[PDB]
């Protein structure tokens, strides 16, 4: 009952340079949005750095 479809990055089609395109499968009928939204909001601000 706690067994889901554990996913994986099937490919990293890094298009050209300083640009990647990472596809992940398979997720549940609703977990693509929650992982996309979690990673999108964290990368946007939380991720630190210098400028």
């Amino acid at each position: 009952v706690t067994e889901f479809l554990k996913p994986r990055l099937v490919d990293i089609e890094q298009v050209s340079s300083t640009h990647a395109k990472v596809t992940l499968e398979p997720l549940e009928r609703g977990f693509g949005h929650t992982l996309g939204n979690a990673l999108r909001r964290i990368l946007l601000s939380s991720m630190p750095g210098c400028a």
Binding site: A38, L39, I42, S46, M47
Partner: peptide, 12 residues
């Protein structure tokens, strides 16, 4: 993913 996993080690 490391940041989000370190923000959940007080639950699991």
């Amino acid at each position: 993913a490391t940041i989000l996993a370190e923000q959940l080690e007080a639950f699991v």
